[PDB]
Amino acid sequence: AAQTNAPWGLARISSTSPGTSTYYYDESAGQGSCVYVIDTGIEASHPEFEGRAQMVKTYYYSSRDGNGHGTHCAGTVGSRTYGVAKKTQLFGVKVLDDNGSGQYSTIIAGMDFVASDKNNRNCPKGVVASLSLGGGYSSSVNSAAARLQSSGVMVAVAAGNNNADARNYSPASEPSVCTVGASDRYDRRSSFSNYGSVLDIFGPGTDILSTWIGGSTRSISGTSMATPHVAGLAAYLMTLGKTTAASACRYIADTANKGDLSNIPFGTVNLLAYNNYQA
């Protein structure tokens, strides 16, 4: 399948090269997989989700995304225009209030929630979780990411936005999950991407068009926008049969565009997520 005049990041993770605008992909498109967006919530009523999205948890007084962040990240995963995995099932978990603030202990609660709940869902092709959030190093936050991953969920986490080595941030520094940095449409590291040997992969994160609340769209920027490209990609690769929740971060790295970003500080991977469909 081909989707012309696509947001640049969907074209990128289907290209070897920058500078084009079609998103080339296999039509199975994540059918039979499940992606949990653990964030401010998802405006499931957005027609771009077409009935595939459900809130299933909150730790606040409403499950609604009253911020838009969770809805945008979820759209990149799996909205019909703006998504990687256009036919995946989306499940929301609201661990952030309507300003973007979550206490750690609640974010932990969300995470163990997914390891349990996946067992309440129909996900024959595999389960992913997408965490576009974080704060300073915590062993506990990191332990809750290793548990979620160990429970057979592909876990994708934002490396962070301080232009700093990510080993000091959580859940990014955790080893066993898939820590995602951000790039731009000219294959530069985005100016705000954390970096450091704990990163596994880079995805598109600067001027990412996606869904927003009210039924609407916007473009924003962050390792948060990069993260759901890798989550959605992993859902897409499960569904096909290329990899598994426990193997997907390694498979994506193995199949990435290798060398191609400029400003990878020394010691940071120079790997860019790629679906290997068109070549």
- Provide the annotated binding site: 16, 175, 177, 200, 260
Give me the catalytic one of 33, 170, 183, 224: 224
The beta-strand segments (E) located in 116-220 are 126-131, 135-136, 154-158, 169-170, 178-183, 201-204, 208-212, 216-220
Closest residue to Ca ion using C-beta atoms: 249
Residue for token digits 């066993």?
176
Least distance in angstroms from the C-beta of 63 to Ca ion = 30
Distance separating alpha carbons of residues 242 and 154, to the nearest angstrom = 14
Strand partners, 272: 202, 257
User: Do 35 and 93 contact (CB within 8 A), yes or no?
Assistant: no
* Marked catalytic residue, from 46, 69, 72, 229: 69
Q: How far is the CB of 127 from Ca ion (least distance, A)?
A: 16
User: Site residues for Ca ion, window 109-168 (CB under 5 A)?
Assistant: none
The binding track of 173-212 with respect to Ca ion, each residue x by CB under 5 A or -, is ---------------------------x------------
Q: In terms of CB distance, is 107 or 249 closer to Ca ion?
A: 249
Question: What does the radius of gyration of the chain's CA atoms come to, in whole angstroms?
Answer: 16
69 is catalytic: yes
Distance CA 124, CA 113 (A): 19
Largest pairwise CA distance in the chain: 48
- 39 part of the active site: yes
Closer residue to Ca ion (CB): 213 or 249: 249
What minimum distance in Å lies between the beta carbon of 249 and Ca ion? 4
Tell me which stretch binds Ca ion (CB under 5 A): 96-104, 144-152, 214-222, 242-250: 242-250
Residues whose CB is less than 8 angstroms from the CB of residue 154 and which lie 6 or more positions away in sequence, other chains included: 126, 127, 128, 129, 178, 231, 234, 235, 238, 245, 246, 248, 249
Least distance between Ca ion and beta carbon 24 (Å)? 27
**248 interacts with Ca ion by CB under 5 A:** no
| Cβ nearer to Ca ion, comparing 15 with 227 | 227
Q: Is residue 249 close enough to count as binding Ca ion by CB under 5 A?
A: yes
Is 235:33 a contact under the CB 8 Å cutoff?
A: yes
Of 230, 240, 241, the C-alpha closest to 269 is 230
By CB under 5 A, how many residues form the interface with Ca ion?
A: 2
Binding residues for Ca(2+): 16, 175, 177, 200, 260
Is residue 72 annotated as a catalytic residue, yes or no?
A: no
Closer to Ca ion by Cβ: residue 90 or 269: 269
Asked if 90 and 54 count as a contact pair (C-beta separation under 8 A), the reply is: yes
Cβ proximity to Ca ion, 6 vs 155, nearer residue? 155
Closest separation in Å from C-beta 62 to Ca ion: 34
Q: Rounded distance, CA 257 to CA 160, Å?
A: 22
Catalytic residue (one of 14, 33, 39, 173):
39
The residue among 124, 264, 152 whose CA lies nearest residue 201 is: 264
* Residues labelled as active-site residues: 39, 69, 224
Q: Where on the chain is the footprint of Ca ion (CB under 5 A)? A: 200, 249
